[model samples]
Target: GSSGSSGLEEVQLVVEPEGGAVAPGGTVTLTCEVPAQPSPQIHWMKDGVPLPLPPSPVLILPEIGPQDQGTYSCVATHSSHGPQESRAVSISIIEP
Candidate 1:
C-alpha cells in the first residue's frame, strides 16, 4: 500500500510577521490552514513533541524567550481520513 492520504484535504502552516524571527518577549502566532475551519482537531508540535495546550486551530506563543527557539509543526485531522501533517518551521529569538 502506498504511504499517502489520497483525496484528503491539505494542511499548511501560516506564520505571522512574515519570518520566524521575533524580538525577545514578543509573541508569535501560527495558524493551521484547512478546507473546513470548524471541528478540526489541530495539534501544534515543538521539536516533534506535542504542546501542553489544548487542541486548537491556532497556536499562540506569548512572551517568547530564548528557550522558545525550535522547530515547530502542525498536525490536523478533520475526519476518519487520518492526520495531515504540515511542514516544520523554526522560530528564533532576535536580540533587541
Candidate 2:
C-alpha cells in the first residue's frame, strides 16, 4: 500500500552501536543517518543535552569513562516532516 503526491515522507534515523554494555577507557563511535529528500538537519543529543559540535551525522567519543555513560539520541528534521528523533541508545561503561 502506498500513497500519492504527499510532499512529506516518514524519516527514520539509525544509530550505530545500538546501546549496550561497553568497557571503560574505550573509544566508541556513533553514526546517525536518515533518508530524506532535499536533505535534513542532523541534531545530536546526549542525556537530553545538546551536543557541543557542528551539525554532523557522526559522533565520536575518544575516551569513555564512568561519567560518560548515558543515553544518546539523534534528531533529524526536515521542512516537510518537521522533526524526528531516533530511539535512545543507552551506553553503559563498566569499570575495567
Candidate 3:
C-alpha cells in the first residue's frame, strides 16, 4: 500500500478574519497563527503586493478605508522549502 513521496513538512496559515466587514476610517489588524517550530515568516499581501513586515504577528493598518481594502494574503514560507499560502482573506472597507 505504498502511496507516494514524502517530503519535508511545512507550515500553513490558519485563522483569518471575515471578509468585507472592516469599516472605513478604522484600524484593522489581521493575525495569522501557525503550529510550526521556529515560526514561519508571515507575509502580508495587499492586492498581491507584499506589505512591509511589521514587528507584530498582527498586521495593523491605521485609518483603514476603501483604499486599504483588497485581497489580503498570509504566506508562510519554510526556511528550507517554498511557500504555503492561506485561503485569501478579502477585506472590504465600508462607511462607518
Candidate 4:
C-alpha cells in the first residue's frame, strides 16, 4: 500500500538576489522561482510581515532607502498545499 497523493510534496522555492548591499538611489528587485504545477502566488514580506504590494513573481523596491532597510522574504501560497515561505534576505542599505 502507499499514501495518497504522494506527488503533493512541497515544491522547491528560491528567491533571487537574496539581498545584498545596495547604495542609495539604487534599485532593488526580488523574484521567487517556482514551478507551474502549484502556480503559487508570490508575495513579499518585510520584517516577517506580509506587505500590501501587488502580488507577483517579481517585486520592485523603487524607494528602498535607509528607512526601508529590513529583512525581506518571499511567500508562496498554494491552492491545495500548505503555504510556504522562503528565507529572509538581509538588505544592508548604505548612505551616499
Flag clash pairs in model 4.
Answer: none
Indicate the TM-score of model 3.
0.67
Question: Which 10 consecutive residues of model 4 have the lowest summed lDDT?
Answer: 7-16
Sorted by lDDT (best first), the order is 1, 2, 4, 3
* Per-residue accuracy of model 1 over 1-96 as CA lDDT, tens digit each: 468856633776787655877998889888875666565778888887887888777788898888998888888776565777887778998776
Superior candidate under TM-score, 3 versus 4: 4
Candidate 4 lDDT over 1-85, as tens digits, reads 3575444434343433443657765677776757764346777878867788788776777756787778887777777656676
lDDT of 4 at 3: 75
Cα deviation in Å at residue 50, candidate 3?
Answer: 1.7
Name the runs in model 4 displaced over 4 angstroms: 1-19, 36-38, 94-96
Worst 10 residues of 3 by lDDT: 8-17
Put the candidates in TM-score order, highest first: 1, 2, 4, 3
What are the per-residue Cα lDDT tens digits for candidate 3 across 32-71? 6566645667777777787666734567667877677677
Query: What tens-digit string does per-residue lDDT give for candidate 2 at 2-86?
Result: 5755444354444434545567777777666565444467787887889788877667776778888888777777665666777
Which of the two, 2 or 4, has more TM-score? 2
Off by over 4 Å in 2: 1-16, 37-39
Off by over 4 Å in 1: 1-9
The pairs that clash in candidate 1 are: none
C-alpha TM-score for every candidate: 0.78, 0.72, 0.67, 0.69
lDDT of 3: 0.63
